[PDB]
Amino acid sequence: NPSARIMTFYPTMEEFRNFSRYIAYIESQGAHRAGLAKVVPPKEWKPRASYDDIDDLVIPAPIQQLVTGQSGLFTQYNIQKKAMTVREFRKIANSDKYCTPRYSEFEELERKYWKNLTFNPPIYGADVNGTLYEKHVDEWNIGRLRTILDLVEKESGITIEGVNTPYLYFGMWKTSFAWHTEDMDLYSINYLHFGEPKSWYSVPPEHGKRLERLAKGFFPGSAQSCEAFLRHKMTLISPLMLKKYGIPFDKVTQEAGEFMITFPYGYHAGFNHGFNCAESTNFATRRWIEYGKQAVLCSCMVKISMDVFVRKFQPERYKLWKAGKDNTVIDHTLPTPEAAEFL
Ligand SMILES: O=c1[nH]cnc2c(-c3cscn3)nccc12
Numbered sequence: 001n002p003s004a005r006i007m008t009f010y011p012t013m014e015e016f017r018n019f020s021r022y023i024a025y026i027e028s029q030g031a032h033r034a035g036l037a038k039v040v041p042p043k044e045w046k047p048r049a050s051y052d053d054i055d056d057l058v059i060p061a062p063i064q065q066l067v068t069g070q071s072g073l074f075t076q077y078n079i080q081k082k083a084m085t086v087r088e089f090r091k092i093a094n095s096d097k098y099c100t101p102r103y104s105e106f107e108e109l110e111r112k113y114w115k116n117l118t119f120n121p122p123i124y125g126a127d128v129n130g131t132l133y134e135k136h137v138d139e140w141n142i143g144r145l146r147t148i149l150d151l152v153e154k155e156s157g158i159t160i161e162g163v164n165t166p167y168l169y170f171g172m173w174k175t176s177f178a179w180h181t182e183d184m185d186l187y188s189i190n191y192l193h194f195g196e197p198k199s200w201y202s203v204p205p206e207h208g209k210r211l212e213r214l215a216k217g218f219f220p221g222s223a224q225s226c227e228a229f230l231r232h233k234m235t236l237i238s239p240l241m242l243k244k245y246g247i248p249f250d251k252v253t254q255e256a257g258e259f260m261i262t263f264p265y266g267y268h269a270g271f272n273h274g275f276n277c278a279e280s281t282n283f284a285t286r287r288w289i290e291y292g293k294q295a296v297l298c299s300c301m302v303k304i305s306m307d308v309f310v311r312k313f314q315p316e317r318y319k320l321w322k323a324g325k326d327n328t329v330i331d332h333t334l335p336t337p338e339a340a341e342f343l
């Protein structure tokens with residue numbers, strides 16, 4: 001993977017101000033090809049003054065992550081636990097039982113992860129509805145991105161928790177997210193508010209179908225039951241397992257005060273190093289509409305009506321698409337049309 005490598009951007013305050021323009025910019029640079037990019041905000045930017053007032057914040061459905069498996073192939077089962085505050089969570093997170101092990105370098109922590117993920121199941125304070133951004137913060141506000149995704153809520157009034165609303169994730173050592181693509185193969189924004197880092201793995205969109213073929217071969221039962229079983233967010237595949245079967249991939253560690261952008265059809269997975277808090281939501285560009293149209297969905301779920309997007313940005317193709325005669329082939333290497341002013 002030569003251009004599939006993950007790229008890091010350091011925008012200035014003037015550049016950082018227009019979110020959508022910056023997304024068109026990093027694509028004009030080829031960031032989209034890796035499926036995952038890191039954006040480091042200007043030093044003068046902060047989304048909240050202090051995180052000292054969130055101790056009484058309630059995580060309504062903490063999930064205990066049970067992992068079953070061997071030889072680089074695992075399945076994560078989520079067991080819902082009773083609601084707990086952030087204070088109670090941080091106590092468990094930093095406790096002797098669940099705290100991060102002592103380690104010399106990342107390669108060492110990543111080895112401990114993969115050696116111990118079926119043991120001592122951690123608790124993930126996942127899918128908490130809310131934001132930690134102060135009301136006045138106008139730059140890169142997860143709560144209000146203002147992308148073309150806004151058409152879903154503007155035309156219908158439909159709200160999809162986590163998709164067009166922000167979610168909070170309070171993690172602890174070994175908690176994790178399985179290989180997946182966003183709902184409707186949308187983009188995603190992820191900001192690590194505070195705490196220990198979040199490490200990520202990504203398969204470039206051009207090679208996504210290869211990860212899909214692999215996962216099918218390993219879990220044929222799941223594949224017969226549902227074409228899009230990776231959408232269940234239960235499949236954990238070791239970087240060694242990928243390397244062995246020639247799946248190209250890249251890794252990156254996100255630290256507190258950094259952003260991670262996932263692009264349409266960008267397969268990603270990762271784990272939390274220790275006690276931290278990340279905010280996340282989905283967004284879109286004109287480039288995404290074709291991905292939404294062609295997204296293979298779960299058949300066991302988030303389904304957005306594409307009719308509104310096709311009508312607005314693709315009126316020419318609306319008759320053909322509704323007839324099922326739209327044979328458009330997606331080029332994963334191409335940037336969004338919005339990047340025209342740069343490239
Ligand atoms: O750290 C995470 N914790 C939980 N979920 C994550 C997702 C995710 C979940 S649903 C779509 N993307 N994607 C990236 C990172 C995370």
Ligand SMILES: [Zn+2]
Nearest residue numbers: 181182188262
């Ligand atoms: Zn994701």
Ligand SMILES: [Zn+2]
Nearest residue numbers: 226298299300
């Ligand atoms: Zn399914």
